[PDB]
Design a protein around this ligand. Sequence first.
Ligand SMILES: *C(=O)/C=C/c1ccc(O)cc1
Length: 125
Amino acid sequence: MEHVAFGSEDIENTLAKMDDGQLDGLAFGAIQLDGDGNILQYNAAEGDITGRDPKQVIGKNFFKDVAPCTDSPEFYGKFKEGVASGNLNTMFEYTFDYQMTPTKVKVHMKKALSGDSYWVFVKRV
Ligand SMILES: *C(=O)/C=C/c1ccc(O)cc1
């Protein structure tokens, strides 16, 4: 297993070195989005939590296609405020309930070290 703790202060530096295969060794869900919300990376732990097949969601828009329950001021609204500002670091609890059993999770959104990319980390609560 890859040893990185959910919510670590330097998580973006640690994950910058990770290929899709190493991202799959994380103890929590990790999704990398571009500024428009398109999925660039989606790890195995995230698929375990949500039921989505990782390879199938890459390239889809997270807010429009995959996760409509997140299209709200409380999730997507925070993401879009962060992209526009060029800075994002927020953690909050949320319930995923689209085409799945309602599941309570802790979400951490953070701007990646890379230019136009943002991370969404997820763990069960
Ligand atoms: C609500 O529509 C949430 C859906 C969802 C959350 C996280 C995922 O990775 C996939 C779908």
